[PDB]
Amino acid sequence: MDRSERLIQLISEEGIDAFLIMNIENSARASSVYFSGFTGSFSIILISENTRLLITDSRYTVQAKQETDFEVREVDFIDVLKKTVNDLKIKTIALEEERVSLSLFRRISSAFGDRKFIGIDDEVKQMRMVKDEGEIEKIKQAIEISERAFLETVQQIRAGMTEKEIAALLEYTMRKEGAEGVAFDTIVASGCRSALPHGKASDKVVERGDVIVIDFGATYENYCADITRVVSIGEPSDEVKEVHSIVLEAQERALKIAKAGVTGKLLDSVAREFIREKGYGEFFGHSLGHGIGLEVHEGPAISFRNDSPLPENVVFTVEPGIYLEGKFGIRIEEDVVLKEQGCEILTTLPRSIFVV
Amino acid sequence: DRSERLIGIDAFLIMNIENSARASSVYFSGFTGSFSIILISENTRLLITDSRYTVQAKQETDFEVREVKGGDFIDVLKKTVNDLKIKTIALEEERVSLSLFRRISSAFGDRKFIGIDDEVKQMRMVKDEGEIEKIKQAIEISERAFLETVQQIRAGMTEKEIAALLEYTMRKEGAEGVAFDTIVASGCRSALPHGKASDKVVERGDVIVIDFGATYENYCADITRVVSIGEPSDEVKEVHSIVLEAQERALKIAKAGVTGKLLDSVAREFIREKGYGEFFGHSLGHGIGLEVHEGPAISFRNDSPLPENVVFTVEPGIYLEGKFGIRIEEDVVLKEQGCEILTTLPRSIFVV
Ligand SMILES: [Cl-]
Ligand SMILES: [Cl-]
Ligand SMILES: [Cl-]
Ligand SMILES: [Cl-]
Ligand code: NA
Ligand code: NA
Ligand code: NA
Ligand SMILES: [Zn+2]
């Protein structure tokens, strides 16, 4: 399926003839998926009234015909695309100028010298930021898959395994539960590595006593989950327990004020204020969260710098973190949907430390 | 080093945002994170990032690490270019969005920009020993996982199940990830040069082409081997023999100075003489490195003499529509008097 219909409605309202997506090496993967249903890394998509064209190479010709109801052409795509643009008398073309390189844009500009280009990045971003109930359903499914897999994987964790072996098991188990991919490189940060906010599962061997931050998420029907929980090999120290309690309380304070109209800045501020008055401000994470959907990193940004009022049905994460350099770190993350007078938490896993 | 080798341009600017310029960030600084604004000049090696990566960046690079603790990173960057009196800036304009270029243009105001994409690609095309070691490791992980996976293949499994098992095994064997989605094409689907893993069930007698590759420390492997549940037919054995002999003909003459055009031609000619010219692939190989597809292209169109230490694949194939296909792929490093084959897996059909 695809949402090309609402896109057509969008450009037609402004008299724009067509929308061009240039997905090369996944440069516009999410847009390609959202507007055509194609999940591949290469796709040149042209959408206009009564026109749905998708140009891709031999690696994806069959796939594109399976995933979309577009007219698929196999192919250097500029000359091929221009033929259609001219045959359909398309004069104005909308583009996502944040998703086209300067060099490619100059190539397109030179080839289409008699055309007018219109950046619609803001409109497309707003379109994707507010999820339909169908999308929220898919995100929830991805979360359900992720959580079931986590529960089956967590007790199998033990000293001697490498962080990558743990990540491997979790990812394969998500596939067992229905995941059709992984949303991002699973993070399994053990011991001192747990103090690194966003590293990745490494060859480091997990040791007894290790605090382990696990950030994971499956994809299902193209939508993503993003969950973070903490595991401890053996009973955690009182200090670890205390930092964990502060993180949990900070998260809950942000969740209590989340409602339509709130800004990412305000949400971030309540967690930030709570943590710093406890004396841990210098160890607080960079931002409180981010949006999710077709991607693990999309709007809205739940940070100190985002003062934009958030409308209902945006989907984002709430994940305060406290990292003590050279010692350990703690981060707990929920996925939520903003609603008119509060929010809807989609994650359900216990937030307590999983002691194994 | 690379930054020095790259060094009337005053500085080179890499703007890695949400991994938008990850390859270059990794190549020039060693940093593996998603956010890094790098400035390189004769007297400056600066990496700007935020608290998500400060400690990591200091562990991974010898660059001065600057953390943006407030405002927009563009303002810090602007402050830096002005303090350093940088007037002409080099960019990989294939790796900077139109919108981002507008933002820096307005911020720097007067600066002149020059694209150096071709020069950077030329640098990455010739690998140093450290890179080859990483590629070798990605290959070793890939091969160990392959041997463990083939012994678990069961008639009745789908191509996707085999692909998933192989990827899981690579991950547990140390892979950072996969270079590309594992391809498992069985039976008539093996005759599809680009046929991807599907729900098709693998049966006894099916030719199973498996194209896979793990990534290790950001470098990629790209291997293709053939598996068969039970002894393969005499025809499959014959076609496989021809593909292998064609591959050997190309590998035999591969050395610094040779052209991809000749390598492709010798493999193609052999296949044609054997009566399969109409079923030959389109290209003989492609380069590998921080990405699965990079220079040099081992095709009829590339007549440029290949220098020592380029790293590429040699993968001839014969595809018989409706029947089966055979492809065997090696990863090699070009040397002065020959080539170093990095892939060690036997090229014979793996009968399980
Ligand atoms: Cl409230
Ligand atoms: Cl603060
Ligand atoms: Cl509602
Ligand atoms: Cl310019
Ligand atoms: Na289960
Ligand atoms: Na509330
Ligand atoms: Na360092
Ligand atoms: Zn996260």
XYZ file of C-alpha atoms and ligand atoms in Angstrom:
716
model
C 0.000 0.000 0.000
C 0.991 3.663 -0.202
C -0.095 7.202 0.626
C 0.354 8.740 -2.821
C -3.283 9.862 -2.757
C -2.801 12.347 0.085
C 0.409 13.490 -1.605
C -1.481 14.253 -4.821
C -4.028 16.176 -2.765
C -1.151 18.096 -1.193
C 0.560 19.249 -4.396
C -2.730 19.858 -6.226
C -3.747 22.354 -3.538
C -0.730 24.454 -4.508
C -0.915 23.867 -8.258
C 2.205 21.696 -8.312
C 2.199 19.142 -11.148
C 4.267 16.348 -9.645
C 6.418 15.042 -6.814
C 9.816 13.513 -7.536
C 11.581 11.182 -5.118
C 15.165 10.202 -5.847
C 16.030 7.274 -3.606
C 19.628 6.249 -4.349
C 21.560 4.019 -1.944
C 18.642 4.555 0.449
C 18.974 8.355 0.313
C 15.166 8.609 0.395
C 14.128 5.144 1.566
C 11.413 6.257 3.988
C 9.825 8.550 1.389
C 9.941 5.760 -1.197
C 8.278 3.381 1.266
C 5.695 5.907 2.472
C 4.583 7.048 -0.980
C 5.001 3.887 -3.075
C 5.416 0.873 -0.802
C 8.774 -0.013 -2.356
C 11.359 -0.962 0.284
C 14.503 -1.136 -1.863
C 17.592 1.089 -1.897
C 17.176 2.406 -5.450
C 13.979 4.007 -6.712
C 13.227 7.126 -8.744
C 9.579 7.896 -8.123
C 7.379 10.319 -10.027
C 3.878 10.993 -8.740
C 1.294 13.179 -10.469
C -2.408 13.091 -11.296
C -3.121 9.723 -12.931
C 0.608 8.888 -12.867
C 2.616 6.592 -10.575
C 6.061 5.811 -11.990
C 8.909 3.967 -10.283
C 12.321 3.596 -11.916
C 14.752 1.058 -10.497
C 17.560 -1.277 -11.552
C 17.671 -5.018 -12.229
C 18.276 -5.708 -8.527
C 14.738 -4.519 -7.753
C 12.512 -4.794 -10.844
C 10.630 -7.836 -9.536
C 10.432 -6.571 -5.957
C 9.025 -3.184 -6.987
C 6.257 -4.888 -8.948
C 5.439 -7.016 -5.904
C 5.441 -4.171 -3.361
C 3.764 -1.406 -5.346
C 0.949 -0.723 -7.798
C 3.240 1.716 -9.629
C 4.315 1.531 -13.271
C 7.799 0.034 -12.936
C 10.618 0.820 -15.367
C 14.127 -0.652 -15.396
C 17.250 1.339 -16.285
C 21.586 6.789 -15.102
C 17.925 7.705 -14.699
C 17.789 11.385 -15.618
C 17.303 10.949 -19.379
C 14.695 8.226 -18.829
C 12.828 10.349 -16.279
C 12.878 13.427 -18.508
C 11.031 11.598 -21.300
C 8.085 11.024 -18.971
C 8.245 14.511 -17.498
C 8.042 15.993 -20.992
C 5.449 13.538 -22.310
C 3.133 14.391 -19.401
C 3.792 18.135 -19.723
C 4.910 18.309 -16.086
C 6.228 21.834 -15.459
C 6.446 22.177 -11.680
C 8.122 19.473 -9.599
C 8.098 19.179 -5.815
C 11.243 17.783 -4.175
C 12.615 17.037 -0.726
C 15.713 19.212 -0.929
C 16.961 17.695 2.348
C 17.070 14.334 0.539
C 18.940 15.282 -2.661
C 22.679 15.968 -2.786
C 24.046 19.254 -4.106
C 25.711 17.404 -6.996
C 22.630 15.405 -7.971
C 20.480 18.506 -7.698
C 22.836 20.350 -10.027
C 22.592 17.447 -12.483
C 18.785 17.533 -12.299
C 18.710 21.334 -12.541
C 20.904 21.280 -15.653
C 18.825 18.570 -17.337
C 15.500 20.204 -16.458
C 16.403 23.816 -17.162
C 12.859 24.689 -18.219
C 11.249 23.224 -15.097
C 10.433 24.807 -11.736
C 11.348 22.986 -8.524
C 9.542 23.415 -5.214
C 10.856 22.193 -1.892
C 8.132 20.472 0.120
C 10.292 19.082 2.919
C 8.239 20.746 5.647
C 4.931 19.470 4.286
C 6.227 15.918 3.897
C 7.756 15.995 7.382
C 4.464 17.122 8.922
C 2.617 14.457 6.950
C 4.815 11.674 8.328
C 5.041 13.097 11.829
C 1.332 12.595 12.495
C 0.510 8.883 12.316
C -2.791 7.366 11.195
C -4.235 4.666 13.430
C -3.050 2.073 10.913
C 0.552 3.165 11.382
C 0.248 3.187 15.156
C -1.090 -0.364 14.887
C 2.022 -1.440 12.970
C 4.376 0.338 15.386
C 2.626 -1.424 18.279
C 3.060 -4.765 16.492
C 6.787 -4.089 16.089
C 6.931 -3.301 19.809
C 5.024 -6.484 20.729
C 7.458 -8.551 18.671
C 10.425 -6.796 20.278
C 9.187 -7.236 23.824
C 8.280 -10.920 23.460
C 11.720 -11.593 21.984
C 13.410 -9.643 24.773
C 11.661 -11.684 27.472
C 12.701 -14.940 25.791
C 16.278 -13.731 25.342
C 17.008 -12.017 28.657
C 17.206 -15.092 30.890
C 19.590 -16.781 28.434
C 22.127 -13.992 28.984
C 25.205 -14.940 30.992
C 28.827 -14.093 31.692
C 31.124 -15.303 28.943
C 28.947 -14.271 26.026
C 30.094 -11.316 23.954
C 27.834 -8.304 23.490
C 27.463 -9.312 19.834
C 26.381 -12.849 20.741
C 23.660 -11.333 22.934
C 22.621 -8.963 20.134
C 22.598 -11.868 17.651
C 20.284 -13.944 19.820
C 17.920 -11.038 20.434
C 17.706 -10.184 16.728
C 17.159 -13.790 15.614
C 14.523 -14.174 18.314
C 12.732 -11.047 17.096
C 12.617 -12.739 13.694
C 11.212 -15.850 15.397
C 8.367 -13.688 16.720
C 7.571 -12.148 13.345
C 10.048 -9.322 12.826
C 10.712 -8.731 9.150
C 13.833 -6.795 9.932
C 15.693 -4.980 12.599
C 15.094 -1.230 12.986
C 18.730 -0.453 13.808
C 22.002 -2.038 14.927
C 21.146 -3.503 18.325
C 23.038 -1.861 21.144
C 24.359 -4.143 23.887
C 26.658 -2.057 26.099
C 28.119 -3.941 29.064
C 30.202 -2.831 32.019
C 32.140 0.367 31.346
C 30.716 0.388 27.821
C 27.260 1.053 29.279
C 28.549 4.555 29.939
C 28.732 5.141 26.180
C 25.374 6.677 25.129
C 25.237 5.336 21.588
C 27.941 2.854 20.706
C 27.089 -0.631 19.460
C 27.339 -4.288 20.437
C 31.035 -5.185 20.386
C 33.251 -8.224 20.821
C 33.678 -7.374 24.483
C 33.010 -10.333 26.761
C 30.296 -9.726 29.346
C 31.501 -10.182 32.925
C 29.807 -11.078 36.180
C 28.615 -7.883 37.836
C 28.119 -6.098 34.508
C 25.357 -3.545 34.058
C 24.129 -3.912 30.475
C 22.120 -1.359 28.517
C 20.201 -2.995 25.684
C 18.612 -0.775 23.017
C 16.702 -2.780 20.418
C 13.801 -2.721 18.019
C 12.188 -4.849 15.352
C 10.554 -3.629 12.167
C 7.159 -4.919 11.080
C 5.347 -3.934 7.904
C 7.967 -1.194 7.583
C 7.425 0.386 11.007
C 9.904 0.532 13.878
C 10.123 -0.050 17.599
C 12.844 1.486 19.795
C 13.145 0.105 23.308
C 15.868 0.301 25.952
C 16.060 -1.725 29.153
C 18.801 -2.590 31.620
C 20.142 -6.022 32.510
C 22.495 -6.840 35.370
C 24.627 -9.968 35.641
C 23.993 -10.645 39.309
C 22.426 -8.320 41.873
C 23.239 -4.681 40.999
C 24.996 -2.380 43.475
C 23.035 0.151 45.508
C 24.542 2.950 43.397
C 23.333 1.331 40.180
C 19.896 0.868 41.721
C 19.837 4.532 42.782
C 20.808 5.881 39.360
C 18.223 3.582 37.794
C 15.539 4.927 40.140
C 16.430 8.508 39.206
C 16.215 7.672 35.498
C 12.824 6.017 35.969
C 11.465 8.957 37.958
C 12.752 11.436 35.372
C 11.020 9.441 32.640
C 7.751 9.334 34.569
C 7.795 13.095 35.181
C 8.121 13.768 31.465
C 5.350 11.287 30.696
C 3.012 13.063 33.123
C 3.077 16.387 31.283
C 2.985 15.008 27.753
C -0.151 16.102 25.868
C -0.995 17.773 22.558
C 0.403 21.298 22.516
C 3.486 20.478 24.566
C 6.923 21.053 23.038
C 9.856 18.666 22.954
C 11.722 21.351 24.875
C 9.222 21.301 27.750
C 9.268 17.505 27.973
C 13.068 17.482 27.999
C 13.115 20.247 30.619
C 11.142 18.382 33.295
C 13.471 15.377 33.144
C 16.496 17.685 32.985
C 15.344 19.705 36.001
C 14.633 16.628 38.113
C 17.965 14.978 37.363
C 20.094 18.090 37.864
C 18.524 18.931 41.213
C 19.454 15.408 42.308
C 23.021 16.408 41.443
C 23.392 14.325 38.241
C 23.101 17.077 35.643
C 26.609 16.593 34.259
C 25.770 12.971 33.442
C 22.403 13.573 31.739
C 21.957 12.461 28.131
C 21.938 14.821 25.148
C 18.203 14.634 24.436
C 15.153 13.009 25.998
C 13.938 11.261 22.877
C 13.047 11.205 19.211
C 10.210 10.311 16.892
C 9.759 6.899 15.298
C 7.809 5.417 12.380
C 9.286 4.208 9.119
C 12.566 5.290 10.703
C 14.173 5.135 14.147
C 15.227 8.767 13.792
C 12.486 11.093 12.551
C 10.409 13.941 13.981
C 9.673 15.095 16.576
C 12.941 15.684 18.394
C 12.306 15.651 22.151
C 15.153 17.988 22.993
C 16.078 21.268 24.615
C 16.136 22.962 21.196
C 12.731 21.912 19.840
C 10.157 24.508 20.869
C 7.531 23.433 18.327
C 4.089 22.535 19.736
C 3.438 18.834 19.105
C 0.034 17.775 17.696
C -1.815 14.632 18.684
C -0.708 11.331 17.185
C 2.965 12.103 16.791
C 4.911 9.044 18.003
C 8.131 9.439 19.954
C 10.425 8.027 22.601
C 11.032 9.105 26.189
C 14.442 7.867 27.221
C 16.370 9.818 29.841
C 19.870 8.530 30.462
C 22.576 9.045 33.072
C 26.112 8.083 32.115
C 28.985 7.986 34.595
C 32.084 8.086 32.397
C 34.400 5.143 33.004
C 31.874 3.381 35.238
C 28.410 2.636 33.862
C 25.300 4.176 32.366
C 21.541 3.713 32.623
C 18.872 4.473 30.031
C 15.235 3.378 29.995
C 13.040 4.004 26.957
C 9.297 3.955 26.261
C 7.559 4.533 22.929
C 4.521 6.800 23.147
C 1.744 8.380 21.099
C 0.764 11.955 21.932
C -2.943 12.446 22.604
C -5.260 15.385 23.292
C -5.056 15.405 27.102
C -2.062 13.201 27.777
C -0.208 10.386 26.058
C -0.504 6.692 25.220
C 2.418 4.443 26.160
C 2.889 1.620 23.653
C 5.706 -0.202 25.438
C 4.889 -2.629 28.263
C 8.127 -4.309 29.398
C 8.887 -3.937 33.112
C 11.272 -1.000 33.555
C 13.016 -2.546 36.541
C 16.516 -3.932 36.063
C 16.441 -7.483 34.706
C 18.739 -9.409 37.036
C 20.114 -12.599 35.493
C 48.030 9.464 6.804
C 44.885 9.984 4.711
C 44.128 13.504 5.934
C 47.696 14.488 5.104
C 47.591 12.682 1.756
C 44.420 14.620 0.978
C 45.968 17.870 2.228
C 44.133 26.543 -3.380
C 41.728 24.976 -0.900
C 42.189 25.963 2.746
C 40.257 23.080 4.313
C 38.102 20.009 3.710
C 34.740 19.849 5.464
C 32.836 16.621 6.129
C 29.291 16.986 7.423
C 28.170 13.640 8.808
C 24.622 14.107 10.092
C 22.492 11.038 10.804
C 25.175 9.062 8.935
C 24.874 11.248 5.823
C 28.663 11.119 5.366
C 29.607 8.092 7.442
C 32.076 6.516 5.004
C 34.206 9.660 4.807
C 33.921 10.260 8.552
C 35.178 6.727 9.209
C 37.833 6.882 6.483
C 39.471 10.153 7.524
C 39.016 10.139 11.312
C 38.217 6.605 12.441
C 35.025 7.784 14.165
C 32.107 5.357 13.760
C 29.212 7.457 15.064
C 26.302 9.085 13.244
C 27.165 12.714 13.989
C 30.497 14.289 13.137
C 31.349 17.633 11.558
C 34.977 17.294 10.503
C 37.364 20.037 9.419
C 40.736 19.063 7.945
C 43.566 21.419 6.971
C 47.362 21.503 7.122
C 47.170 22.698 10.739
C 43.725 21.496 11.795
C 42.187 18.079 12.493
C 38.899 18.883 14.203
C 35.872 16.701 14.876
C 32.754 18.420 16.189
C 30.004 16.274 17.706
C 27.733 16.230 20.772
C 27.593 14.410 24.124
C 26.176 11.296 22.451
C 29.646 10.683 21.017
C 32.265 12.778 22.834
C 33.870 9.913 24.756
C 33.559 7.514 21.811
C 35.102 10.023 19.407
C 38.084 10.489 21.700
C 38.535 6.714 21.885
C 38.330 6.282 18.109
C 40.229 9.263 16.682
C 43.323 11.377 17.332
C 41.404 14.430 16.068
C 40.788 17.320 18.406
C 37.230 16.596 19.625
C 34.893 19.571 20.078
C 31.512 19.161 21.756
C 28.545 21.360 20.847
C 26.910 21.987 24.207
C 24.553 24.725 23.066
C 22.782 26.129 20.039
C 23.253 24.985 16.457
C 26.448 23.199 15.433
C 26.533 25.437 12.368
C 27.239 28.449 14.591
C 30.178 26.640 16.181
C 31.370 25.628 12.718
C 30.954 29.212 11.510
C 32.927 30.478 14.502
C 35.678 27.975 13.709
C 36.022 28.761 10.004
C 36.169 32.477 10.812
C 38.724 32.081 13.610
C 40.921 29.970 11.334
C 40.533 32.409 8.434
C 39.402 29.642 6.083
C 38.112 31.090 2.806
C 38.014 28.173 0.356
C 36.370 24.927 1.448
C 36.472 21.500 -0.183
C 33.338 19.339 -0.016
C 32.076 15.979 -1.234
C 29.083 17.614 -2.875
C 27.584 14.157 -3.505
C 27.468 13.862 0.301
C 25.864 17.206 1.280
C 22.147 17.859 0.779
C 20.934 20.866 -1.168
C 19.235 22.250 1.940
C 22.309 21.768 4.113
C 24.475 23.493 1.507
C 22.151 26.492 1.604
C 22.448 26.643 5.389
C 26.257 26.612 5.431
C 26.419 29.003 2.476
C 24.405 31.591 4.410
C 26.334 30.953 7.622
C 29.798 31.296 6.086
C 28.584 34.128 3.887
C 31.649 34.713 1.693
C 33.248 31.246 1.349
C 34.085 29.524 -1.931
C 33.274 25.815 -2.268
C 35.026 23.202 -4.402
C 33.879 19.628 -4.953
C 36.505 16.920 -4.435
C 34.329 13.820 -4.716
C 36.456 12.282 -7.477
C 39.671 12.757 -5.507
C 38.226 11.084 -2.408
C 36.952 8.152 -4.471
C 40.435 7.788 -5.961
C 41.896 7.619 -2.449
C 39.485 4.930 -1.271
C 40.064 2.881 -4.416
C 43.604 1.943 -3.361
C 43.535 0.194 0.012
C 46.268 0.271 2.609
C 47.200 -2.900 4.477
C 45.065 -2.001 7.483
C 41.947 -1.866 5.337
C 42.769 -5.165 3.662
C 43.137 -6.729 7.116
C 39.630 -5.547 8.029
C 38.206 -6.855 4.756
C 39.979 -10.152 5.424
C 38.333 -10.312 8.846
C 34.887 -9.607 7.406
C 35.549 -12.481 5.009
C 36.745 -14.854 7.735
C 33.599 -14.175 9.770
C 31.524 -14.739 6.630
C 33.193 -18.040 5.761
C 33.076 -19.510 9.269
C 29.363 -18.676 9.423
C 28.831 -20.172 5.969
C 30.388 -23.543 6.852
C 28.356 -23.736 10.069
C 25.168 -22.780 8.240
C 25.503 -25.196 5.324
C 25.593 -28.153 7.706
C 22.236 -27.025 9.106
C 20.461 -26.643 5.779
C 17.392 -28.885 5.566
C 15.260 -29.758 2.571
C 11.954 -28.015 3.196
C 13.467 -24.771 4.498
C 12.728 -21.590 2.564
C 15.446 -19.454 0.994
C 14.637 -16.735 3.525
C 15.069 -19.155 6.431
C 18.526 -20.085 5.186
C 19.426 -16.413 4.711
C 18.237 -15.540 8.230
C 20.202 -18.418 9.773
C 23.356 -17.384 7.921
C 23.001 -13.763 9.024
C 22.394 -14.803 12.631
C 25.494 -16.990 12.572
C 27.601 -14.193 11.058
C 26.435 -11.864 13.822
C 27.298 -14.336 16.566
C 30.639 -14.940 14.826
C 31.503 -11.247 15.171
C 29.867 -9.441 12.261
C 29.027 -5.777 12.825
C 26.195 -6.403 10.376
C 25.648 -7.498 6.797
C 27.161 -5.778 3.744
C 23.899 -6.419 1.905
C 20.834 -8.593 2.334
C 21.906 -12.201 1.931
C 20.841 -13.713 -1.362
C 19.679 -17.331 -1.436
C 18.340 -18.381 -4.838
C 17.313 -22.004 -5.294
C 16.222 -24.134 -8.225
C 14.967 -22.100 -11.167
C 15.485 -18.945 -9.102
C 19.240 -19.534 -9.134
C 18.985 -18.660 -12.817
C 18.062 -15.145 -11.680
C 21.299 -13.105 -11.517
C 19.624 -10.783 -9.016
C 16.988 -13.111 -7.591
C 16.575 -12.282 -3.900
C 15.778 -14.667 -1.035
C 12.104 -15.624 -1.149
C 9.644 -17.964 0.542
C 10.463 -20.618 -2.055
C 11.192 -23.976 -0.434
C 14.565 -25.581 -1.202
C 14.289 -29.195 -2.387
C 16.648 -32.082 -2.988
C 18.558 -31.555 -6.219
C 18.037 -27.794 -6.176
C 21.003 -25.650 -7.092
C 21.339 -23.094 -4.284
C 23.336 -19.951 -5.012
C 24.242 -18.099 -1.824
C 25.678 -14.574 -2.087
C 26.595 -13.158 1.312
C 28.913 -10.861 3.194
C 29.441 -9.631 6.721
C 30.748 -6.201 7.652
C 33.563 -5.855 10.168
C 34.880 -2.541 11.413
C 32.972 -0.931 8.548
C 34.537 -2.999 5.771
C 32.666 -5.506 3.601
C 32.958 -9.029 2.265
C 31.128 -10.238 -0.854
C 31.149 -13.990 -1.408
C 29.111 -16.354 -3.597
C 29.147 -20.146 -3.416
C 26.891 -22.977 -4.565
C 25.186 -25.541 -2.334
C 23.223 -28.627 -3.336
C 21.110 -30.953 -1.231
C 22.395 -34.269 -2.521
C 24.768 -34.949 -5.407
C 24.114 -32.503 -8.254
C 23.205 -33.610 -11.783
C 25.879 -34.049 -14.438
C 24.638 -30.896 -16.154
C 24.934 -28.806 -12.997
C 28.429 -30.218 -12.562
C 29.342 -29.252 -16.123
C 28.042 -25.682 -15.923
C 29.735 -25.226 -12.556
C 32.992 -26.514 -14.052
C 32.774 -23.923 -16.826
C 32.025 -21.030 -14.472
C 34.980 -22.042 -12.290
C 37.346 -22.377 -15.255
C 36.243 -18.970 -16.537
C 36.946 -17.488 -13.110
C 40.376 -19.136 -13.044
C 41.259 -17.702 -16.462
C 40.636 -14.174 -15.188
C 42.388 -14.711 -11.854
C 45.410 -16.182 -13.653
C 46.176 -12.912 -15.465
C 45.093 -10.525 -12.715
C 47.980 -8.258 -11.691
C 48.743 -4.544 -11.349
C 48.418 -2.797 -14.701
C 45.761 -5.090 -16.154
C 42.396 -3.639 -17.163
C 38.966 -4.694 -15.978
C 38.064 -4.808 -19.662
C 40.582 -7.602 -20.320
C 39.655 -9.563 -17.194
C 36.005 -9.426 -18.216
C 36.883 -10.355 -21.792
C 38.922 -13.464 -20.968
C 36.199 -14.826 -18.680
C 33.496 -14.004 -21.219
C 35.427 -15.500 -24.137
C 35.941 -18.786 -22.309
C 32.229 -19.051 -21.533
C 31.405 -18.220 -25.152
C 33.792 -20.870 -26.485
C 32.076 -23.380 -24.198
C 28.694 -22.542 -25.707
C 27.156 -20.424 -22.943
C 27.908 -16.923 -24.226
C 24.206 -16.035 -24.299
C 23.795 -16.854 -20.600
C 26.824 -14.961 -19.259
C 26.368 -12.209 -16.684
C 26.799 -8.528 -17.526
C 29.834 -7.626 -15.390
C 32.693 -9.720 -14.000
C 33.053 -7.865 -10.717
C 33.085 -4.694 -8.632
C 35.233 -3.070 -5.985
C 34.562 -3.374 -2.273
C 35.615 -1.408 0.814
C 33.614 0.745 3.223
C 30.759 0.010 0.802
C 29.754 -3.152 -1.086
C 29.770 -1.386 -4.456
C 32.655 0.972 -5.207
C 35.528 1.209 -7.685
C 37.002 -0.401 -9.675
C 34.289 -1.766 -11.938
C 35.501 -4.982 -13.564
C 33.590 -4.544 -16.806
C 33.992 -4.143 -20.555
C 33.561 -0.363 -20.240
C 36.470 0.165 -17.842
C 39.762 0.141 -19.740
C 41.771 1.918 -17.038
C 44.931 0.130 -15.841
C 44.220 -1.083 -12.309
C 46.882 -0.080 -9.744
C 48.228 -2.269 -6.966
C 45.993 -2.755 -3.924
C 42.600 -2.089 -5.457
C 40.182 -4.648 -3.989
C 37.462 -6.171 -6.146
C 35.304 -9.200 -6.810
C 35.634 -11.738 -9.632
C 32.292 -13.417 -10.135
C 31.467 -14.893 -13.533
C 28.139 -16.652 -13.884
C 26.027 -18.696 -16.271
C 22.254 -18.366 -15.958
C 19.893 -20.780 -17.717
C 16.344 -19.413 -17.401
C 13.822 -21.914 -16.071
C 16.589 -24.320 -15.098
C 19.351 -23.022 -12.838
C 22.273 -20.646 -12.573
C 25.806 -20.813 -11.219
C 27.958 -17.991 -9.869
C 31.233 -18.273 -7.952
C 32.693 -15.126 -6.412
C 36.104 -14.335 -4.918
C 37.379 -11.125 -3.301
C 40.877 -10.218 -4.439
C 43.611 -7.645 -3.925
C 45.711 -6.723 -6.952
C 49.468 -7.039 -6.509
C 52.576 -6.340 -8.575
C 53.024 -9.815 -10.078
C 49.610 -11.330 -9.421
C 46.691 -11.116 -7.025
C 45.940 -12.058 -3.441
C 42.702 -14.039 -3.173
C 41.180 -13.189 0.220
C 38.332 -15.692 0.032
C 39.390 -19.188 1.136
C 36.204 -21.265 0.881
C 36.443 -24.171 -1.565
C 34.851 -23.240 -4.895
C 33.406 -26.710 -5.436
C 29.692 -27.268 -4.879
C 28.916 -27.857 -1.202
C 26.881 -31.054 -1.172
C 24.804 -31.526 1.958
Cl -1.160 16.696 32.034
Cl 20.682 21.452 32.676
Cl -7.188 9.312 19.771
Cl 29.480 26.744 -5.018
Na 7.440 -17.342 21.965
Na -0.494 13.960 31.907
Na 41.973 9.714 20.906
Zn 17.222 4.948 21.564
